[model samples]
Target: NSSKCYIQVTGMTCASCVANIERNLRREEGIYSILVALMAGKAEVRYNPAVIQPPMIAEFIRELGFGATVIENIEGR
Candidate 1:
């Protein structure tokens, strides 16, 4: 029903950034939930794969004025 994605984001200066990102991401369509781990400088997002893809989610975060990068699928590593 959904997919899990890990996104490494930049430009999060404080706790508010985490709160704001989580708050807004929850409001977006297709996204089931999100956890902004400031300590890890990344976020875990679960969303409807049928309605959205991992790359698109990163783009959505970019629209929020932050740099977002998806975890590369490194099957060899």
Candidate 2:
């Protein structure tokens, strides 16, 4: 049920932007956690796959007027 991934993100300009994505992601039921770096344009996410998936997680960021893609997906580690 647990999964983790590195997601590439674009269009984030400030801490508030990072915070916005984090807040939105935290609202999702299966999203266990998220760490975003505005300078790197990357995010590390941990989640429960039975409730969410990597693609869907990226979509959450996408919906926030940002670009997101999976850099890697690890099911258990």
Candidate 3:
């Protein structure tokens, strides 16, 4: 099933950082969609938990050189 979650991100310098988060995460297998707001300082992603865990989503952003944490979690497709 697909689960939606909001991730708070820090260390983003500009809009390019938002695109980087969306682009890189899209390349991942389990992530379905990601919308990052540069001004809001957060991102929303829907991912397949069967293939990826909730915490793992944050890890991907973390690996991108940003501080990431899940702010909200919505279960189901």
Q: Which candidate ranks first by TM-score, i.e. highest?
A: 1
Please write out the lDDT profile of model 2 over residues 26-63, one tens digit for every residue.
Answer: 77668777757667556888887677666777776777
Better of 1 and 2 by TM-score: 1
Residue 24 alpha-carbon offset, candidate 3, angstroms: 0.3
As for lDDT, the candidate ahead, 1 or 2, is 1
Which lDDT values do the candidates have, in the order given? Answer: 0.74, 0.71, 0.74
At residue 2, give the lDDT of candidate 2. 62
Q: Model 3, range 2-70, lDDT digits (tens) per residue?
A: 767887777545568887677787887687787476575678888887787878877777776588877
lDDT of 2 at 7: 77
The total number of steric clashes, by the backbone 3 Å criterion, in model 2 comes to 0
**TM-score of every model?**
0.77, 0.73, 0.76
After superposition, which runs of candidate 1 have C-alpha atoms over 4 Å from their true positions? Answer: 72-77
User: For candidate 2, what is the lDDT?
Assistant: 0.71
Query: What's the number of clashes in each of the models?
Result: 0, 0, 0
